[PDB]
Design a protein around this nucleic acid. Structure first.
Length: 200
RNA sequence: GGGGCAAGAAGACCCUUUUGAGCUUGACUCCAGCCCGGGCCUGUGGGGCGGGGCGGCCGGCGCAGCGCACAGGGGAGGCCGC
């Protein structure tokens, strides 16, 4: 049950991995959970709660975004969205997670903001005075029709004790989401990006 | 032998009764009988198939695109010269 020993090995295999390593300990850690007593047809589905967010925002949010290092955009490609509809698929893939503006809600809501979600991207509302900076820090369950759920503990090189806190939070939450409870999950795995999986 | 509505015989016809019986069925509720399955009786052996668990490995076409994309993640570089 103790996941600490398997986490302790993670640093050891990291030695030969190398990798792209953006704010990663030479890789990204993952939690892969198998499932039992559940199928896509029935409905106890629940959606609940380096890394990046697309700052589709306005003045000040843009100024902090260049200073932080996040891409910032407004009406330039808003109108160009009318010119190309593939443009909304191109920019949704361009940013794994997105970040809308509360002030700039007006322009995207009337336009391609739900179009962004047609490909599958909904940006997160941000007034510039509210800290776009601390929203990054804020950054889940998704049974839907997927029986097998894999999430990333993160490109975390942070202490293994923090790593085990997140390995636990997801796990108690997954059971809280599963009607049987902790006995609806067949397997729990912890692994490096190109490295092998280790159990709980 | 006309009458004594002469005598038998608490009409056996037909009604009534929360009164019966015999028979019937595809009435309601059932019982023997029988058929069927498993347990017990009930020993001493030899096999074979299938499930579950494990456990290797192999696969999967609307073409749009680059081709059969099984999917959930990681992932821009690893370790394929990819």
């Amino acid at each position: 049950i103790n996941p600490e020993a398997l986490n302790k090995h993670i640093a050891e295999i990291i030695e030969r991995a190398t990798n792209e390593k953006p704010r990663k300990f030479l890789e990204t850690v993952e939690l892969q959970v198998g499932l039992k007593g559940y199928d896509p047809k029935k409905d106890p589905r629940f959606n609940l709660p380096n890394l990046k967010l697309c700052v589709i925002a306005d003045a000040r949010d843009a100024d902090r975004a260049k200073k932080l290092g996040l891409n910032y955009v407004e009406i330039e490609h808003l109108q160009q969205f009318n010119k190309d509809a593939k443009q909304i698929k191109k920019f949704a893939k361009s940013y794994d997670v997105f970040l809308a503006s509360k002030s700039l809600i007006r322009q995207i809501t009337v336009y391609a903001g739900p179009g962004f979600t047609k490909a599958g991207r909904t940006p997160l509302p941000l007034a510039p005075d509210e800290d776009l900076e601390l929203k990054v820090l804020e950054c889940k369950v998704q049974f839907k029709k997927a029986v097998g759920l894999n999430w990333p503990i993160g490109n975390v090189k942070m202490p293994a004790s923090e790593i085990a806190q997140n390995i636990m939070t997801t796990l108690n939450f997954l059971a809280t989401q599963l009607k049987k409870g902790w006995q609806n999950i067949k397997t729990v795995y912890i692994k490096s990006t190109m490295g092998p999986s280790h159990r709980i």
